């Protein structure tokens, strides 16, 4: 296997060195006339390529016959074809390019004197040594990090960044076309009597400059529009991902922190992306142009320059991780400061009522001190990285100058070509310095975007929404041995073995002391949390099997401290309905909940914009608005979580009528968590949830007869 | 209920006291008010 392959390779090398070296030039000199030495070289190259390719194909066929040994030998043999192609076509291609470059200054010595170079052992060795590394690189490329995640944002915008690149290339070509058509300045400006040369050159230069300026204008417009789209899309995606998480993700991550990550980290990421990507593409194109000019100058020195760039990019690869960690810490400290500010500015009555503005200021100052200690390191690293880049490029230039001096002394390179190459290599090194300065910025951008990409890639720890949207839902809820422990403290059980049922047309009061778990029951029945044990069925099927919006318009809850958003009362009452309700429905809901009386009396009525914290609405009015919001949905399950604590006499009468008198009571089941015994006394069922377990249940008369916990609670004030 | 927490009086309450029951929040507010030995005490729905 391997031995046969190596023997075949050795035989191929020997045959190429012996026969193809000498026989082919003679044959193609006899067949072809002397008037076309380039044709002779091309024919010899094609013949050598064909012979080597046939030999490689034969070797591959022979090796495929046996499969007992390893596949590494086949992998190495896979590069025989490209190596043979390079060997065959290196010389004829160079000869063709040199002939096409100029028809009056031939480099000669390759196209002519064809056999004098094909049979030349020195030229044979040179061709082999040139073909080996090119073939190795081609084979290595063909056989084929957080930065990839960072750059994946520019996926759908390739068709526009390509236009940007095309316009940049056109601008570069227009810039370079000035010296190639007008020459050096002194060639025409200094000449006295210039009438057909000064005006011509001046107009041509002005036209080219104007064209380049307009091309740059169009490219910049395209690029900025694309970057704006990228920024908007990324911010929207991050916000959606944050909102797709679970209910406890927002108890571990605080409001100000999440807000800073969503609004500020993305903005900085996008700004860095735009600036550095424009810079990188422009300098890449101009560096490629400079490399073309340098290759025209001296190919050997250009290759020497290209060999040493990884040496310059070594250190940035080492310090990128330090940059990333530094920026991660900076973003985290900024988020903590944002949390402090948000928490303080949202409870100003409480801060002032305890004279604690100084303490909030001190907390903010501590976070800012952390950020300052990080910024010191940022600045020192900036200075040191600048030093390193400058020294690196200076050493590159110095080494190239020394090698060029050695070559000019040795006669390998002419002085004029050397000077041209040096003058353009200085610009190339400046562009390399710009790219080196870009690299730390990309590392810092990775550090900044770490947390938002963690948000985007995070997997919510909650079941996905189902697909059930039955036309008619009865509203029959069943807790079957339901047990629950909060994810942050799973060792403690808040609910243990809750078993009960809510039937439409009936009211089930849930009474007990504080911390018993009643609001936890309400949260479980709203699908905010999944029970750890047992099962919770709505209409005989688990809540996760129902669609999100269908479930949350079929089960409506008035919370213990209802949240009201900063919008008109009309928009608060109908908050989350796909079809905006008519004002008749809104006023009907407000009448049912008793919120019509005070809403109508407002100067603007239902258009009264509410404060962010709902401070305009007094206690009791906010609960009435929340009840109207719950009732406008016409839900099948209605949870009232201490909803009568703040309601006045009129709203209390309204809720009593809604529960036990309204004709709609037959179409829904009510879970009435409360402590007002007036409503509990009429409740069809009563459950005394004490310590997370239902100590007793039944109607009011039964519990009073039992003289258990319920009787003790009722007669406690009478003691 | 303080001693039943994970770390007693060093337990994090959460943003806006979210990791707490309503009555526990009211009792904590009452304790905060009383720790100062105020001359004037204003109980605004302190037992709702
Ligand atoms: N987000 C949370 N994380 C951890 N524990 C919590 C959380 N919310 C509430 N608890 C705890 O769960 C227990 C029950 O709280 P819950 O609000 O369900 O009781 P409750 O009987 O409805 O209270 P109240 O009568 O004061 O309204 C309490 O010990 C409370 O501290
Ligand atoms: Mg509660």
Q: Read off φ and ψ for residue A209, nearest 5 degrees.
A: -65, -45
At a CB cut-off of 8 Å and minimum separation 6, what does A440 contact? A316, A319, A320, A323, A381, A385
Beta bridge partners of A480: A535
Nearest alpha carbon to residue A286 among A419, A171, A207, A396: A171
Among residues A601, A667, A673, the alpha carbon closest in space to that of A642 is found at A673
Q: Rounded to a whole number, what is the distance in Å from the CA of A450 to chain B's nearest CA?
A: 24
Residue nearest to atom 5 of ligand 1 (CA): B19
Helix residue ranges per DSSP H, A79-197: 80-101, 114-118, 121-143, 146-151, 158-182
Assess contact for A270 and A278: CB atoms under 8 A: no
At a CB cut-off of 8 Å and minimum separation 6, what does A186 contact? none
DSSP H helices in A244-356: 249-252, 255-260, 266-297, 299-307, 309-345, 348-353
Angle in degrees, 0-180, between the axes of helices A2-15 and A37-65, rounded to the nearest 10: 160
Measured between beta carbons, the chain B residues lying within 8 angstroms of A646 are 48
List of long-range contacts for A394-397, beta carbons under 8 Å, 24+ apart: A396/A305, A396/A308, A396/A312, A396/A429, A396/A432, A397/A425, A397/A426, A397/A429
End-to-end CA distance of chain A: 101
- CA–centroid distance for B35 within its chain: 11
Tell me whether A690 touches chain B (CB under 8 Å): no
User: How many whole angstroms separate alpha carbon A364 and alpha carbon A434?
Assistant: 37
Cα A656 versus chain centre, distance? 53
CA angle B15, B20, B26 (to 5 degrees): 100
Partners of A483 in beta bridges: A533
d(C-alpha A138, C-alpha A706), whole Å:
90
Interchain pair B48, A343: CB under 8 A: no
Is A512 assigned to a binding site? yes
Mutation site, B13, B14, B21, B36, interface A, largest A CB count within 10 A:
B21
With a 6 A CB cut-off, is B5 part of the ligand 1 pocket? no
Q: Determine whether the shortest distance from the Cβ of B18 to ligand 1 is under 6 A.
A: yes
Q: Parallel, antiparallel, or unpaired for β A477-484 and A495-502?
A: antiparallel
Element (H, E) at B17: none
Would the CB atoms of B15 and A255 count as touching at under 8 Å?
Answer: yes
Q: How many CB atoms lie under 10 A from the CB of residue A688?
A: 21
What stretch of H or E contains B1? none
Does residue A488 belong to the interface with chain B, where contact is any CB pair within 8 Å? yes
Give yes or no for residue A520 CB within 6 A of ligand 1: yes
The phi, psi pair for A481, rounded to 5°, reads 55, 40
Closest ligand 1 atom to the C-alpha of A517? 18
A638: nearest Cα among A654, A653, A626: A626
d(Cα A291, Cα B21) in Å, to the nearest integer? 71
Max Cα distance, chain B (Å): 34
The answer to whether the beta carbons of residues A200 and A178 sit under 8 Å apart is no
Bridge partners of A479, per DSSP, are A500, A536
Residue among A251, A515, A619 whose CB faces B18 most closely: A251
User: Which is nearest to A385 in space by CA: A441, A448, A304, A310?
Assistant: A441
Measuring CA to CA, which residue among A345, A282, A341, A672 is closest to residue A512?
Answer: A672
Number of C-beta neighbours around residue A260 at 10 A? 22
Ligand showing the shortest atom-to-Cα distance for residue A510: 1
Instruction: Report the largest interatomic distance among the alpha carbons of chain A, rounded to a whole angstrom.
Output: 130
Residues 6+ apart with CB under 8 A from A625: A562, A564, A569, A572, A573, A593, A595, A599, A617
What whole-number distance in Å separates Cα of residue A558 and Cα of residue A592?
A: 14
Task: Give which of A560, A584, A557 is closest to A570, Cα–Cα.
Answer: A584
What is the spatial distance between Cα A445 and Cα A148, in angstroms, rounded to a whole number? Answer: 12
Query: Is there an atom of ligand 1 within 6 Å of A517 CB?
Result: yes
Nearest CA to ligand 1 atom 13: A515
Q: Is the CB of residue B47 less than 8 Å from the CB of residue B26?
A: yes
| Secondary structure of residue A188 in the 3-state scheme | coil
Distance in angstroms (rounded) separating the CA atoms of residues A516 and A526: 18
Q: How far is CA A587 from CA A370, A532, A581, A584, B20, in A?
A: 53, 41, 10, 5, 35
DSSP helix/strand/coil, A453: helix
The answer, for A514 touching chain B at a CB cutoff of 8 Å, is yes
For A650-714, what is the HEC assignment? HHHHHHHHHHHCCHHHHHCEEEEECCCHHHHHHCCEEEEEECCEEEEEECHHHHHHHCCHHHHHH
Q: Which atom of ligand 1 lies closest to the CA of B24?
A: 26
Question: What are the Cα distances from residue A229, in Å, to A151, A279, A519, A696, B38?
Answer: 15, 19, 43, 61, 58
Breaks (C-N over 2.5 A) in chain B follow: none
Nearest CA-CA partner of A169 in A1, A286, A17: A286
* A25 known member of a binding site: no
A560 interfaces chain B, CB cutoff of 8 Å: yes
Query: Could you tell me the CA-to-CA distances from A466 to A245, A484, A531, B3 in Å, in that order?
Result: 16, 22, 17, 41
Residue A154's CB is within 10 A of a number of other CB atoms, namely 15
Instruction: Find chain B residues with C-beta within 8 A of A353's C-beta.
Output: none
Give the mutation candidate from A514, A558, A691 for the B interface (greatest B CB count, under 10 A).
Answer: A514
Nearest CA to ligand 1 atom 11: B20
Q: For residue A558, how far is its CA from the centre of ligand 2 (angstroms)?
A: 11
Annotated binding-site residue? A621: yes
* Residue from A484, A519, A523 to probe ligand 1 pocket by mutation (most atoms less than 8 Å from CB): A519
CB A128 within 8 A of CB A102: no
The answer, yes or no, to whether any atom of ligand 1 lies below 6 A from the CB of B22, is: yes
Neighbour-count burial of A571, counting CB atoms closer than 10 A to its CB (0-12 exposed, 13-18 middle, 19+ buried)? middle
CB-based burial, A384-414: b 16+ in 10 Å, e otherwise: ebeeebeebbeebbeebeeebeebeeeeebe
The DSSP code for A385 is H
Q: Output the 3-class SS for A602-662.
A: CCCHHHCECCCCCCCCCCCHHHHHHHHHHHCCCCCEEEEECCCCCCCHHHHHHHHHHHHCC
| A376 annotated as ligand-binding | no
Classify the phi-psi angles of A620: left when phi > 0, otherwise alpha if psi is within -120 to 50, otherwise beta.
left
Shortest CB distance from B21 goes to which of A343, A515, A645? A515
List residues bridging with A696 in a β-sheet: A688
Residues 6+ apart with CB under 8 A from A660: A507, A682
What is the rounded CA–CA span in Å between residue A184 and residue A203? 15
Q: How many CB pairs under 8 A join A and B?
A: 28
Please state, in angstroms and rounded to a whole number, the distance separating the CA atoms of residues A502 and A477. Answer: 5
Would you mind telling me the total number of residues written for chain A in this entry?
719
Ligand 1 atom, smallest distance to A518 CA: 22
> Which residues are bridge partners to A669 per DSSP?
A637
Q: Enumerate the residues of chain B whose CB falls inside 8 A of the CB of residue A513.
A: 23
Q: Of all atoms in ligand 1, which is nearest to the CA of residue A248?
A: 1
Residues near A629 by Cβ (< 8 Å), separated by ≥ 6?
Answer: A556, A572, A573, A574, A575, A589
Contact A531, A452 (CB under 8 A): no
CB within 8 Å: A343 and B15:
yes
| Least CB–CB distance from B24: residue in A255, A489, A515 | A515
With contacts defined as CB-CB under 8 Å, which chain B residues touch A255?
15
Strand partners, A637: A555, A669
Q: Rounded to an integer, what distance in angstroms lies between the CA atom of residue A522 and that of residue A559?
A: 9
């Amino acid at each position: 296997g391997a031995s046969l392959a190596w023997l075949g390779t050795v035989l191929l090398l020997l045959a190429d060195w012996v026969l193809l070296r000498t026989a082919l030039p003679r044959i193609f000199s006899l067949l072809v006339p002397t008037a076309l030495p380039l044709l002779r070289v091309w024919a010899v190259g094609l013949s050598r390529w064909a012979v080597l390719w046939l030999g490689a194909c034969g070797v591959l066929r022979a090796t495929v016959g046996s499969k007992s040994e390893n596949a590494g030998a086949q992998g190495w043999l896979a590069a025989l074809k490209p190596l043979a192609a390079a060997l065959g076509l290196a010389l004829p291609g160079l000869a063709l390019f040199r002939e096409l470059i100029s028809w009056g200054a031939p480099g000669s010595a390759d196209s002519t004197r064809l056999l004098h170079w094909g049979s030349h052992p020195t030229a044979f060795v040179v061709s082999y040594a040139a073909a080996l590394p090119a073939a190795a690189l081609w084979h290595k490329l063909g056989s084929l990090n957080p930065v990839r995640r960072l750059l994946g944002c520019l996926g759908s915008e390739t068709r526009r960044l390509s236009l940007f690149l095309v316009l940049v290339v056109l601008s570069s070509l227009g810039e370079m076309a000035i010296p190639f058509f007008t020459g050096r300045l002194t060639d025409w400006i200094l000449q006295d009597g210039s009438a057909d040369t000064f005006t011509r050159n001046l107009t041509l230069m002005s036209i080219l400059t104007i064209a380049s300026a307009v091309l740059e204008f169009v490219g910049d417009g395209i690029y900025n529009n694309t970057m704006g789209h990228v920024h908007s899309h990324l911010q929207g995606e991050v916000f959606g991902a944050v909102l797709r998480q679970e209910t406890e993700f927002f108890q571990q991550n605080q409001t100000g922190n999440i807000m800073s990550r969503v609004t500020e980290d993305t903005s900085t990421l996008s700004d860095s992306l735009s600036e550095n990507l424009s810079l990188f593409l422009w300098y890449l194109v101009r560096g490629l142009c400079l490399l073309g000019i340098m290759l025209w100058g001296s190919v050997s020195l250009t290759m020497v320059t290209l060999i040493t760039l990884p040496l310059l990019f070594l250190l940035p690869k080492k310090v990128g991780k330090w940059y990333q960690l530094l920026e991660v810490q900076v973003r985290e400290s900024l988020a903590k400061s944002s949390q402090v500010a948000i928490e303080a500015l949202s409870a100003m009555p409480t801060v002032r009522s305890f004279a604690n503005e100084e303490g909030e200021a001190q907390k903010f100052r501590e976070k800012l001190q952390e950020i300052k200690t990080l910024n010191q390191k940022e600045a020192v690293a900036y200075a040191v990285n600048s030093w390193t880049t400058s020294i690196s490029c200076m050493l590159l230039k110095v080494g190239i100058l020394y090698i060029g001096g050695q070559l000019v002394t040795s006669g390998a390179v002419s002085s004029g070509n050397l000077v041209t190459f040096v003058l353009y290599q200085m610009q190339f090194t400046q562009a390399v310095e710009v790219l080196l300065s870009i690299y730390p910025r990309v590392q810092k951008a990775v550090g900044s975007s770490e947390k938002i990409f963690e948000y985007l890639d995070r997997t919510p720890r909650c079941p996905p929404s189902g697909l059930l949207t039955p036309l008619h839902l009865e509203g029959l809820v069943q807790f079957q041995d339901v047990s629950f422990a909060y994810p942050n403290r799973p060792d403690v059980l808040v609910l243990q073995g809750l078993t009960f049922t809510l039937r439409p047309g009936e009211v089930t009061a849930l009474v007990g002391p504080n911390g018993s778990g009643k609001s936890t029951v309400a949260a479980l029945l709203q699908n905010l949390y999944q029970p750890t044990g047992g099962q919770l069925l709505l209409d005989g099927k688990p809540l996760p099997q129902y669609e999100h919006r269908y479930l949350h318009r079929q089960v409506a809850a008035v919370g213990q401290e209802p949240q009201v958003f900063g919008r008109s009362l009309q928009e608060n009452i109908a908050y989350g309905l796909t079809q905006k309700p008519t004002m008749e429905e809104i006023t009907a809901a407000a009448v049912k909940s008793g919120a019509h009386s005070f809403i109508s009396g407002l100067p603007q009525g239902y258009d009264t914009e509410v404060d962010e914290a709902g401070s305009q609405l007094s206690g009791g009015q906010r609960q009435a608005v929340a009840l109207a919001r719950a009732l406008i949905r016409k839900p099948c399950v209605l949870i009232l979580d201490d909803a009568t604590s703040a309601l006045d006499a009129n709203s209390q009468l309204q809720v009593e009528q809604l529960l036990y008198e309204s004709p709609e009571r037959y179409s829904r089941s009510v879970l009435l968590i409360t402590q007002h015994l007036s409503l509990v006394e009429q409740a069809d069922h009563i459950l005394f949830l004490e310590g997370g377990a239902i100590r007793e249940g039944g109607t009011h008369q039964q519990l009073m007869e039992k003289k258990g916990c319920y009787w003790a609670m009722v007669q406690a004030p009478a003691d | 209920f303080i001693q039943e927490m994970e770390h007693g009086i060093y337990t994090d309450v959460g943003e806006k006291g979210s990791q707490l029951a309503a009555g526990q929040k009211q009792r904590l507010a009452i304790a905060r008010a009383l720790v100062r030995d105020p001359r004037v005490l204003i109980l605004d729905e302190a037992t709702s």
